[PDB]
Amino acid sequence: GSSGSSGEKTVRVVINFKKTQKTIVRVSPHASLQELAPIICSKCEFDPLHTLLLKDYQSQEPLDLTKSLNDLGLRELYAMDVNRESGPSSG
């Protein structure tokens, strides 16, 4: 991990949630959603334990954590609340 030295060079992203409410936060577009999962969910006091990252409120396609706002090329995203945690992990 990493505490986080300095918190500058951040972009304004839109966090759509509840398919009704939305909020804006300033975070690094570089960091992968995987790392901005909590930074975001937290901002929306959401549970990153069972949270998904869809394109936008409209679209329902899942995004790639590994990919960042840059890699993705989006300024806004939606946080979906599902329930699924099971599978192997190693490489």
UniProtKB/Swiss-Prot annotation:
Residue positions, PTM Phosphoserine: S68
Protein name: Cordon-bleu protein-like 1
Organism lineage: Eukaryota, Metazoa, Chordata, Craniata, Vertebrata
Name of the gene: COBLL1
